[PDB]
Assembly symmetry: C2
Homo-oligomer: 194 residues x 2
Amino acid sequence: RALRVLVNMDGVLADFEGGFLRKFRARFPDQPFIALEDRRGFWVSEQYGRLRPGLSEKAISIWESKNFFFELEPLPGAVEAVKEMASLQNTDVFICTSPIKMFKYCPYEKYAWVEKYFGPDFLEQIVLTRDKTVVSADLLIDDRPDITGAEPTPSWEHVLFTACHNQHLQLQPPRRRLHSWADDWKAILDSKRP
Amino acid sequence: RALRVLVNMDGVLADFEGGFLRKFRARFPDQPFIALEDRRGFWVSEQYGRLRPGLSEKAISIWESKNFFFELEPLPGAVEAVKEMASLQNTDVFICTSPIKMFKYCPYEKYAWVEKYFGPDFLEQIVLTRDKTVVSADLLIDDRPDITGAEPTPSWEHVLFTACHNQHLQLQPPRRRLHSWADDWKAILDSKRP
Ligand SMILES: O=c1ccn([C@H]2C[C@H](O)[C@@H](COP(=O)(O)O)O2)c(=O)[nH]1
Ligand SMILES: O=c1ccn([C@H]2C[C@H](O)[C@@H](COP(=O)(O)O)O2)c(=O)[nH]1
Ligand SMILES: [Mg+2]
Ligand SMILES: [Mg+2]
């Protein structure tokens, strides 16, 4: 009866792309890089890898570093929208995020980031998982085009959140986008209510 | 088509009760304590609290301390059973665990513990969430009797894993127990396959 919405973290709430590019450039000022307008495909590391050998590993070292996740800036309108969304009647919001393989900092910083922007009480709403298909909900708002895993028939509708890496992508028709948090997320939610 | 089983961590894989009692006694040798045979109810902190004021907060300080989760011993047969379970055909196993409120160490140590006992490749199978009802599966093996949250009708069958705190509990009849990892967990799984 309550509408359940999973909101992804990196690329939706937290500006992973901008934070990564900034830190990459500062740390490796003599390497080439991918401007955000030139990003294509979810996997940053694979595009940097195709650009020049050794660059996959240098890219990875940015988000494996301490404070990378913690210091990400919120995307415009994200914190305001999620706060409003969670306060709506008959609406439960979970933040659903996949940690990286190297686990020293990332889980911790993700909890700390959520505490900073949404408050201690919002920590109960965090789901950390590498497989989103085993989390049930009516909606998943996520910038990754291909969301797969152990459940072949997820209960959520995936709404693609626009990002640099996917903005050019033609989706197969039933699939739908939320173009930014300025876009009308309330209408998308309402379309799934009885 | 693949059977999906969520296996809880504390009280099922990791010996939370024994580790907590040991550390509590060493740190607070002049306080009274609850012998494992005398444990009742999921909430350790509430029983210690009823035993004498200030004791809830002393209990909590044990599992909020660094290395508490990391240094938990596996329960007998747990690692062997889960490894066998995951290797079975048409069987996907996720470890589903709820972190404490204080997030400095617990998420990290839980990943580290899983790496230590199950290997790096098993990290992909971890789901950290305070709400298990929004994780979909055929089975949830968990020592907590009352598993509630945002989804009023979870897709899993909850099988109660026996622990000191619940061993005396009469369950409402349809509900079922796995008495230890020496008990016949394969028969429980098979009962849910077509
Ligand atoms: O090339 C990449 C791009 C992203 N990520 C990771 C970083 C995050 O931990 C996760 C995405 O986080 P969420 O969008 O699920 O919050 O993917 C990688 O490992 N490699
Ligand atoms: O009185 C208690 C007993 C347990 N826990 C926490 C410790 C664990 O983080 C969680 C149980 O962990 P899992 O069984 O879900 O792994 O509950 C408490 O906060 N208070
Ligand atoms: Mg994302
Ligand atoms: Mg437990």
